[PDB]
Amino acid sequence: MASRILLNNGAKMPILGLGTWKSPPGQVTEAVKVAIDVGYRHIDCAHVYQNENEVGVAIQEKLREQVVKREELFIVSKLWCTYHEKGLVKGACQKTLSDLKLDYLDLYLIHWPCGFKPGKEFFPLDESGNVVPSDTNILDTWAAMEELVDEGLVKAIGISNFNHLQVEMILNKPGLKYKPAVNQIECHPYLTQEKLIQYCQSKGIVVTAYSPLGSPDRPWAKPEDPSLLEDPRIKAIAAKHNKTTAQVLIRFPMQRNLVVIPKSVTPERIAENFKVFDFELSSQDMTTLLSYNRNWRVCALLSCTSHKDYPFH
Ligand SMILES: NC(=O)c1ccc[n+]([C@@H]2O[C@H](COP(=O)([O-])OP(=O)(O)OC[C@H]3O[C@@H](n4cnc5c(N)ncnc54)[C@H](OP(=O)(O)O)[C@@H]3O)[C@@H](O)[C@H]2O)c1
Numbered sequence: 201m202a203s204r205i206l207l208n209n210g211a212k213m214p215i216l217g218l219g220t221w222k223s224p225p226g227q228v229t230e231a232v233k234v235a236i237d238v239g240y241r242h243i244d245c246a247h248v249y250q251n252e253n254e255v256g257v258a259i260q261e262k263l264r265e266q267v268v269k270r271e272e273l274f275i276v277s278k279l280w281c282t283y284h285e286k287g288l289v290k291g292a293c294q295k296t297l298s299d300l301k302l303d304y305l306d307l308y309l310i311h312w313p314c315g316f317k318p319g320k321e322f323f324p325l326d327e328s329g330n331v332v333p334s335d336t337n338i339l340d341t342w343a344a345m346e347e348l349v350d351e352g353l354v355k356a357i358g359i360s361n362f363n364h365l366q367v368e369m370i371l372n373k374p375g376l377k378y379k380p381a382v383n384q385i386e387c388h389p390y391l392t393q394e395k396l397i398q399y400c401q402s403k404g405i406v407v408t409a410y411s412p413l414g415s416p417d418r419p420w421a422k423p424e425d426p427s428l429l430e431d432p433r434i435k436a437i438a439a440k441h442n443k444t445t446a447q448v449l450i451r452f453p454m455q456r457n458l459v460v461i462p463k464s465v466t467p468e469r470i471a472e473n474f475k476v477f478d479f480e481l482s483s484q485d486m487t488t489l490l491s492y493n494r495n496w497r498v499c500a501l502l503s504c505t506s507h508k509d510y511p512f513h
């Protein structure tokens with residue numbers, strides 16, 4: 201498949217990007233420098249990841265070095281849940297731009313459908329451990345995102361972790377000005393997402409697959425959880441193709457017309473993960489990988505489950 205996918209804003213998005221959640225601030229600058237040197241042109245970021253300044257150092261250095269031009273990079277960030285207020289969205293976006301050393305983002309996402317009480321804490325809790333909601337809804341937050349396009353701060357806007365009904369809510373918004381370009385969701389062989397992907401793709405929304413390797417470094421991992429990278433069935437498909445299991449896990453979403461954003465801070469893995477354009481999984485391989493679905497989610501969070509807009513069940 202082509203290396204870039206056309207979005208419904210008329211721009212092209214690289215189907216392979218570098219993830220940055222959990223990338224330590226003392227390692228992520230080098231990770232991003234290496235990624236750009238070996239061909240990555242898409243970086244997935246977020247304010248809540250606490251490392252945008254260090255990501256930005258790498259981007260700016262590579263632009264200064266003229267390794268790449270700004271127009272050839274596709275930089276994505278996300279509006280955190282404590283900034284779903286009319287009067288906070290622009291400043292949140294601007295702080296991300298300032299940190300990343302950019303004058304625009306290629307894509308800005310509503311990180312989660314849920315608004316939380318504004319303040320210093322990213323997860324404000326009540327005295328019993330429940331997240332404290334904001335009363336601001338996804339439609340008003342979307343209107344605020346639309347303003348960012350109209351102010352030139354972002355070239356595209358989208359959503360992340362929106363369920364079917366939430367995507368539909370946006371699409372049915374009275375007075376909708378810009379459709380979401382992307383819905384970024386968890387997707388891998390244990391959470392194959394056939395239903396939500398078909399819905400989004402049928403509406404011209406591009407899906408980005410996060411945690412494609414099963415996020416083995418997620419801080420809440422438990423020793424007994426399933427492991428994609430260690431699954432002997434996936435290893436066998438990889439061996440057949442003379443590729444690594446990670447390479448199969450990255451190529452899988454690409455052949456479903458998804459964008460995919462594996463994270464690494466290991467230079468050799470960053471390079472490995474990019475070497476996914478010179479082989480093909482068969483249809484039988486694809487169906488076989490799909491058959492491993494078990495509705496197993498990396499990203500979920502008990503403290504947020506009573507929020508009215510919590511997306512999962
Ligand atoms: N929108 C959202 O709500 C959301 C949620 C989750 C994730 N995301 C985005 O999606 C990105 C990817 O997801 P993720 O970080 O959860 O996990 P992931 O990409 O599925 O897995 C990352 C883990 O896999 C390891 N790894 C990477 N390449 C490997 C290879 N070739 N062989 C073996 N191990 C390898 C990494 O180790 P090393 O780094 O030590 O090499 C790290 O421990 C995130 O970083 C973030 O940008 C977004």
Ligand SMILES: O=C(O)COc1cc(Cl)ccc1C(=O)NCc1ccc(Br)cc1F
Pocket residue numbers: 221246248249250312313314499500501504507510
């Ligand atoms: O959300 C992400 O991108 C990855 O996960 C996290 C990253 C950081 Cl830096 C901190 C915490 C998470 C994290 O806990 N994410 C899960 C999450 C969050 C919000 C909601 Br409404 C539901 C939910 F499942």
Ligand SMILES: [Br-]
Pocket residue numbers: 312313314361504507509510511
């Ligand atoms: Br949420």
